[PDB]
Amino acid sequence: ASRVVVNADRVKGTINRNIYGHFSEHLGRCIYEGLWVGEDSPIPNTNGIRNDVLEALKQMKIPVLRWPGGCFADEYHWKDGVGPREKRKRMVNTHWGGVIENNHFGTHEFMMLCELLGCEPYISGNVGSGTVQEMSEWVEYITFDGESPMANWRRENGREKPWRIKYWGVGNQNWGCGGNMRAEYYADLYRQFQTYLRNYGDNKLHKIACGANTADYHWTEVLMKQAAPFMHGLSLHYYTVPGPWEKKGPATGFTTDEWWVTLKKALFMDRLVTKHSAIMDVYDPDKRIDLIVDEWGTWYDVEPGTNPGFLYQQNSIRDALVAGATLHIFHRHCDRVRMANIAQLVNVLQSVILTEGERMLLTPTYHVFNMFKVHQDAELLDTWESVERTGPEGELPKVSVSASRAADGKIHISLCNLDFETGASVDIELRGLNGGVSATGTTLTSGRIDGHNTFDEPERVKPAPFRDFKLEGGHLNASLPPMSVTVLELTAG
Numbered sequence: 376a377s378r379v380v381v382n383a384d385r386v387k388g389t390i391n392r393n394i395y396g397h398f399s400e401h402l403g404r405c406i407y408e409g410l411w412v413g414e415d416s417p418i419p420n421t422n423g424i425r426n427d428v429l430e431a432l433k434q435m436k437i438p439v440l441r442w443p444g445g446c447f448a449d450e451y452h453w454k455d456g457v458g459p460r461e462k463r464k465r466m467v468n469t470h471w472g473g474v475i476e477n478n479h480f481g482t483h484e485f486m487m488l489c490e491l492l493g494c495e496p497y498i499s500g501n502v503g504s505g506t507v508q509e510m511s512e513w514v515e516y517i518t519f520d521g522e523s524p525m526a527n528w529r530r531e532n533g534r535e536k537p538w539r540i541k542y543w544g545v546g547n548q549n550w551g552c553g554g555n556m557r558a559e560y561y562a563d564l565y566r567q568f569q570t571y572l573r574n575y576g577d578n579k580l581h582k583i584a585c586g587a588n589t590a591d592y593h594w595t596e597v598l599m600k601q602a603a604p605f606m607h608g609l610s611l612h613y614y615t616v617p618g619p620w621e622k623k624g625p626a627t628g629f630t631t632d633e634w635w636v637t638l639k640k641a642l643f644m645d646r647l648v649t650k651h652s653a654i655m656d657v658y659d660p661d662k663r664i665d666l667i668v669d670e671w672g673t674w675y676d677v678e679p680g681t682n683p684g685f686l687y688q689q690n691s692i693r694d695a696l697v698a699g700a701t702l703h704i705f706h707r708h709c710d711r712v713r714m715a716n717i718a719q720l721v722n723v724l725q726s727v728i729l730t731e732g733e734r735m736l737l738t739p740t741y742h743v744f745n746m747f748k749v750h751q752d753a754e755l756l757d758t759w760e761s762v763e764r765t766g767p768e769g770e771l772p773k774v775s776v777s778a779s780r781a782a783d784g785k786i787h788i789s790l791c792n793l794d795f796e797t798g799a800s801v802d803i804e805l806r807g808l809n810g811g812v813s814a815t816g817t818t819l820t821s822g823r824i825d826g827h828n829t830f831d832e833p834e835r836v837k838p839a840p841f842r843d844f845k846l847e848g849g850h851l852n853a854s855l856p857p858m859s860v861t862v863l864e865l866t867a868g
């Protein structure tokens with residue numbers, strides 16, 4: 376059995392709710408159809424945004440949403456997306472299908488979406504092909520409460536008082552699609568651009584510099600050495616890609632080897648965060664600067680017969696395990712990691728939701744985010760563990776476990792069983808509790824390693840009650856189902 380000791384009276388820090396963040400690019404059907412259907416759509420909607428998706432995302436408690444992209448954000452000229460909707464310019468979505476963007480979803484529609492969702496906006500500005508004045512004017516347009524060409528324009532377009540926004544990304548993937556820049560050059564641009572992004576009124580911008588791709592430690596070193604005093608956060612991008620880029624593998628119908636490889640690569644997040652954080656510690660020992668993992672998740676070959684530029688992929692219990700295990704990694708590093716954004720909210724990459732016209736389904740990934748929402752802004756509890764191994768040559772931990780205490784005093788313990796073949800015995804010792812407790816549980820599992828939901832069968836994989844445990848005086852013994860994500864709730868009394 377795996378052994379876990381939860382020290383309920385020992386708080387290790389706060390799990391920022393933004394660790395549970397999301398990301399929606401103008402790519403494929405993430406924005407159009409996935410969210411924006413238009414006010415005159417036969418699809419039931421609120422001001423042009425489909426209701427089924429809205430309600431599901433509200434239930435999930437989305438904390439923050441990144442927009443309008445990765446790559447698209449460094450091609451975007453925000454002025455194209457404001458003004459009378461019917462008069463907005465077209466565009467060439469160069470990176471993603473080479474299709475035409477109608478700009479009907481723009482700044483006002485995105486702010487409205489965030490308000491409808493109850494989430495924070497995180498906007499990514501254009502460095503690669505934009506100018507300093509253009510980005511500065513966007514911030515002014517959004518946040519300025521006085522009179523000026525930009526503020527007046529905002530009011531004309533129907534938003535009288537300024538919006539508040541905290542998170543502002545000063546360019547995306549500038550080492551690549553954002554201009555193929557050396558770190559030294561981007562650091563100079565970053566320092567210049569950020570100078571002109573002001574705090575107007577009561578707004579306080581948290582300026583985020585473009586961070587490393589995967590294991591590019593040199594990028595982190597340069598950006599920290601050259602630009603630390605001018606940033607409030609530094610990003611990191613890491614996708615879980617089973618096979619070579621040229622042939623990543625399928626989202627469903629994959630082999631056992633692909634199961635193990637996928638989970639092994641997902642867990643590499645821990646090494647990356649650890650090593651990037653170590654460099655950040657050298658230049659920023661007080662940990663003032665956030666590490667922001669603003670693109671992560673699995674990336675497979677798209678579904679057969681679909682446009683590879685649209686990145687539509689299915690989503691299975693394998694993805695749920697990647698999501699659960701990775702979120703636990705963020706928990707462990709919550710002293711430095713204060714936001715993460717899983718790549719792509721709807722119809723794109725590792726989505727929580729997929730739509731097909733008026734129909735939608737919730738993926739196993741959605742269910743993980745919904746079950747784990749109890750960790751948002753929770754206090755991380757000290758836990759010691761000794762877990763059995765699983766997979767080829769015991770390369771994987773059998774179980775991943777995290778415990779937190781919510782503001783209402785309830786304790787949540789979440790556990791992932793990475794082995795698809797057998798259940799996992801976990802003995803959890805509860806210490807420093809004070810009173811006594813009772814427990815309920817919920818578990819997300821499947822009977823197939825590629826178990827997934829479809830439009831005809833939207834509920835093939837979904838949470839269910841979990842009762843296979845015993846709680847007896849300071850000890851909670853659980854038998855986790857194979858390939859499962861489980862959440863236990865302990866209440867006083």
Ligand SMILES: OC[C@@H]1O[C@@H](O[C@@H]2[C@@H](O)[C@H](O[C@@H]3CO[C@@H](O)[C@H](O)[C@H]3O)OC[C@H]2O[C@@H]2OC[C@@H](O)[C@H](O)[C@H]2O)[C@H](O)[C@H]1O
Pocket residue numbers: 400444445446447469470471547548552588589612614616670718719724
């Ligand atoms: O979310 C979609 C898209 O993803 C981001 O750009 C991705 C990269 O992050 C990806 O990085 C690779 C990760 O694995 C590493 O080993 C490797 O060295 C990295 O290069 O590479 C591809 C890129 O997607 C391309 O975006 C441009 C488009 O024209 C291509 O078709 C895509 O494949 C973006 O930030 C975000 O838009």
